[PDB]
Symmetry: C2
């Protein structure tokens, strides 16, 4: 092996002159508008196909293969959807038939505009908890037992309509990259805290204890106190049944996960023992014997459309924004997880449009918001659902439940539904090991996890997400707040430059300091970079310039006094001692000290490093070349270019050449936008790499010698 290079020393300006730069037309906003507003027949066709995916992928569906698997997967996910939807309608404290409506409508709309195929559309526990809290707040704020239920369902429908409108608006405005804002740690923490919330919520149904609806913040602890205060009145039969169902569900889930290939289809434990619980409650009359709580009979058929409440809109637009954001985030996470496995593209904007239409249609017919449940999506995908048509079948099953089947689920205990919810909550609760894992791996991400969990427990599910998101954005500033700035040195008498303190027998060229900041320089870390540069060089450039200026003022005062005329080669002082006091100039004149040095009047060049006459002392500097390795510096802003230009002006004014190395051409173009370059600070300071600058310095000094 041998690395042999023999080429001329290049600066970026010299690089442009030596090699021809191609003429690349720069796209402008008007040019973009030309493409956007072209309205080509092919472009219009592709746009209308994009907005209506079902027409695109309907003939592509394979009847021979996908149909059989889709039929079974749809049936399984439909049964799961019915049971779940009853459970969340319990969580929202509205009759379960509205949970059935929420299971029905969003999926049947999403079929038409659905990019993904393996997700099941409907409510999930976190979203249903947020909807319940939002309607509780709405009924609290609004100003003038069946009437209370009617008011609750009206508020839920209005909240769902508003969330659907927000999702549709974001989808039309082509903003689907909002998913990227939430990091993995934040989602993990929020999901774990929401699982704790849902467990605490289901406790009241497990013990069959009456608990008033508590709004955020600290709602979880309020519910905990309300339940534990009445722990004596706990219905023993409900607790026993819920515990039994939860135990067998957990064990069954463990069996399914352990034997994935051996087991043909996942065992429908939830449905099986929902049937068992309903039968044992109806036959033995648990409602009268042990006074258990049951969902009771539900009115068949969908409700007529309801006009959205404008008042609820004004009161809960804030909750609706969070509901829509969480719904889209969870749906897109699940859809991406399945797409990467099955290799089919997705449009985030189309996902937003589809979910917005689903929520709008659902809320118009009195159903709460719902996007996608990870558990139900897993059931549909593992069962073998190739296409979104399977979801259709699930919705049909929900319809079959709403019309004529609904009377079967009348004698079903609510504690059973709580147990089914806890069975799914177990997987979310298992994520507590992430604290230790991330603590070993990345401190900032573990901090994000812990802070998100604390915020979501202490605050609500809605405010918790916003605080966590704001906090996570802050950790980005935390990472680059204090960059480990290093001073580099040459080793092996070659172009390799490495951290000065790491290796032995490093060679540092005399009068040359190489400084590297491995972080983007913006408002957060410009002051730290300035302080670290001064620490690395060993002297303050501005202080050196000010002392030099004060010394020059003293010499000029000496010449204007006529006591000591300037020698042709130096300063000839007739008096043995200057005996000159400090000037102590006023405030207004202080800025004069900062002005650059001019030696045009002096007939001879004066170097500050050599000794000065008249007992004048200015700190000496051995630095005559400063290289800034800006390879790792990604971007700059105004607060960065201002500070950087001030630092470069201060260094140049004391005759210390500055070379910035490692930057690409787009960086120099952007720096040209900021009006960074001027007469004093030219573009010749931008060199190609560190060794090019070092060789330039050595050649310049060799010519000087």
């Amino acid at each position: 092996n041998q690395y042999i290079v023999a080429r001329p020393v290049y600066s970026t300006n010299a690089f442009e002159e030596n090699h021809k730069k191609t003429g690349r037309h720069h796209k402008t906003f008007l040019d973009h508008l030309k493409v956007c507003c072209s309205c080509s027949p092919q472009k219009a066709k592709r746009i209308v196909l994009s907005l209506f995916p079902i027409a695109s992928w309907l003939p592509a569906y394979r009847l021979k293969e996908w149909l059989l698997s889709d039929i079974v997967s749809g049936i399984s996910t439909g049964i799961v959807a019915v049971l779940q939807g009853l459970a969340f309608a319990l969580l929202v404290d509205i009759p379960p038939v509205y949970g059935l409506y929420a299971s029905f409508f969003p999926a049947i709309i999403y079929l038409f505009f659905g990019t993904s195929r393996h997700i099941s559309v409907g409510p999930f526990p976190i979203l249903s908890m947020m909807v319940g809290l939002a309607v509780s707040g709405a009924v609290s704020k609004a100003v003038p037992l069946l009437d209370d239920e009617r008011v609750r369902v009206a508020a839920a429908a209005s909240v769902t309509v508003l969330s659907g409108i927000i999702q549709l608006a974001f989808g039309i405005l082509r903003i689907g990259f909002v998913v990227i804002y939430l990091s993995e740690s934040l989602i993990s923490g929020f999901t774990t805290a929401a699982a704790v919330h849902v467990l605490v919520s289901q406790l009241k149904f497990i013990f069959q204890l009456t608990v008033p609806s508590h709004t955020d913040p600290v709602s979880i602890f309020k519910v905990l106190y309300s339940v534990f205060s009445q722990i004596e009145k706990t219905n023993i039969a409900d607790l026993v049944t819920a515990l039994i169902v939860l135990l067998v569900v957990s064990i069954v889930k463990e069996i399914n996960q352990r034997f994935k290939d051996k087991l043909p289809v996942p065992i429908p434990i939830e449905f099986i023992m929902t049937v068992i619980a309903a039968g044992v409650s109806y036959g033995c009359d648990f409602k009268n014997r042990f006074k258990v709580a049951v969902v009771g009979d539900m009115n068949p058929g969908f409700q007529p459309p309801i006009t959205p409440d404008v008042e609820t809109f004004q009161n809960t637009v804030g909750d609706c924004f969070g509901i829509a954001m969480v719904a889209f985030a969870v749906a897109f996470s699940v859809a991406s997880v399945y797409s990467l496995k099955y290799d089919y593209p997705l449009d985030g904007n189309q996902e937003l449009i589809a979910l917005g239409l689903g929520n709008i249609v659902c809320g118009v017919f009195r159903g709460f918001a719902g996007s996608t449940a990870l558990s139900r999506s897993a059931v549909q995908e593992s069962t073998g659902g190739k296409t979104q048509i399977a979801g259709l079948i699930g919705a049909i099953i929900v319809l079959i439940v709403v019309l004529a089947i609904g009377f079967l689920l009348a004698p079903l205990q609510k504690s059973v539904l709580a147990a089914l919810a806890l069975g799914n909550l177990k997987g979310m609760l298992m994520q507590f090991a992430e604290i230790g894992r991330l603590w070993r791996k990345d401190k900032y991400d573990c901090l994000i996890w812990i802070m998100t969990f604390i915020f979501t427990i202490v605050l609500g599910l809605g405010l918790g997400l916003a605080a966590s998101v704001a906090f996570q954005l802050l950790t980005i500033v935390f990472r680059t707040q204090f960059p480990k700035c290093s001073t580099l040195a040459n080793i092996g008498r070659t172009n390799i430059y490495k951290n000065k303190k790491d290796y032995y027998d490093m060679y540092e060229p005399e009068g040359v300091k190489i400084f590297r900041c491995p972080s983007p320089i913006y408002f957060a870390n410009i002051g730290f970079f300035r302080r670290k540069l001064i620490d690395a060089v060993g002297f303050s450039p501005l202080r050196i310039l000010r002392k030099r200026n004060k010394a020059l003022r003293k010499i000029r005062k000496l010449q204007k006094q006529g006591l000591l005329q300037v020698t042709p080669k130096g300063f000839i002082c007739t008096v043995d001692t200057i005996k000159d006091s400090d000037e102590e100039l006023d405030n207004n004149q202080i800025e004069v000290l900062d002005q650059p040095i001019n030696t045009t009047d002096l007939p001879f060049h004066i170097d500050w490093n050599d000794d000065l006459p008249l007992n004048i002392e200015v700190p000496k500097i051995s630095l005559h070349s400063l290289i800034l390795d800006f390879s790792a510096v990604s971007f700059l802003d105004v607060s960065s270019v201002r500070g950087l230009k001030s630092i470069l002006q201060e260094f140049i004014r004391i005759k210390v050449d500055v070379y910035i190395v490692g930057t690409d051409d787009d960086f120099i173009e952007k720096l040209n936008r900021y009006e960074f370059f001027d007469g004093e600070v030219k573009s010749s300071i931008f060199f190609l790499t560190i060794h090019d600058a070092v060789l330039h310095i050595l050649m310049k000094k060799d010519y000087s010698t």
Copy 2:
């Protein structure tokens, strides 16, 4: 000027083996604990000096030179402090006397605990509006002359809580909270607050009874209330306010245009107030035209009041915002002056001093503020060497409170409103920043405009928080969509530049060089993933899946026996097989994504050459990928996992992956993330791009 290098090709691992390292451990927490528990006596002395700066910098006072300047600056600043305190007491809608305590107490405490020397401690319009809004919210939320009493009680409690918060942050040794605010956000917030203060002074120029309005949209409500009563305004008050504003602006322009000519800046504010008071007292303006007057003020300080806990609960967040704004403005001004005069300034002790000042002021029935830019500018312009100027301003305010308060009785409130409007000019002039930042950098212009919109639409306290959140969001915007590029060799040398940028790039066959000029994290890893696949021209995971499917098919044919394995190549007696699709179930699809293992086959199989029995796999020319990670600064767990997935897929499709330009600390951190594995070894890292290219060339040759 010839660049000549002749060294062996170096890999990071071979670099470590070849070159000795220094056993310098960076840090260990036990060492920090030992340092904290050292309790050195010189360390104790330095800590006492840090907590009590006045003892440190008082014997160092230059009585020979600084004394006269401090006296003159203190007097000229104290007069302005009295006027501004009277005006800001009206901004808060409490009696005008309570504004003087703000000028008195915090300056006195900052004398003892203050690091900076040039700033003048006291209220400023931006914080006075915030305190007024806080007390309005507090009196509204609180459950059941008296109105004035409850207003001043709420103001004192809010100030005490803000001082407690500032002191707590100071003890916690966190003073770098200022860096989270940028030049752009502060500019927009200050100009929007100047608009707020102008709208507030409108209600006093016209002398209209406008009720206290809380946020949000607290500025349009005042505009509607004022313009609704536009007929009721007094002509005399309006004309007086306009006259004082005009003369103040003209003299301000004279003072700025002639700085050297004027030895001391003209005290236009004091002269204008003196003339207004004299003309009002002489001509009996209050009885004649029913103009507003300050009136009788009770001499002396009020007895201390115990802070109301209820007010603490009601306005804790607004107190948090008040403290943040006060410290940010104070540190900005103090740093501006310290950089000019070259003296060390401690951020934490600034917080401690301002917190103590706010606490002391709030105990004695007075709202408090950090410092005014206009008053600090006056103090420095006249020339104040040492905080003894602040002390002298404090004594001036004291003698105003005790003896000569009665002089400021027949003063028009519209006059003080015009006085504030005079100083608002500096912040109102900042509207050209929109046009400048539009062409300079559009993200900063967006920060400016969004901060202005938030602060106008919402309150000051909530507007600042929303502006900070959007400020961080713009940081995410900058690196959201990096301009990922592909590089190529130019001039047969080690220089590598954008392929599209120049003419006649030589790109070595089967080598792709990819550069992402941004840190890679959660908001960036997906875009980097998509751009890499776009640049190479083929999806690595899709290639691996197709290869796995084809090779499963040939194993199926082999176990059938139709084709026989031969070292030279695949040999089939019959080539009449019909193509079939396995169509694996959902559970088994993951099997496709497993590292191709051909050890069973007796002959190596290469995917680029044609495959027998009509089996097609997308051929890839690329055989070595270089990732120029010089620009990449940091990675989180979300980006590291994605990067490992991409590298694992590329290695699984039998293409080499190198990562060049990284520092030693980068690899050390990557070791912590458990990124390295028996597959993704540490040998992939190389020093520069050309070392990797030379290694590839030697490997292929």
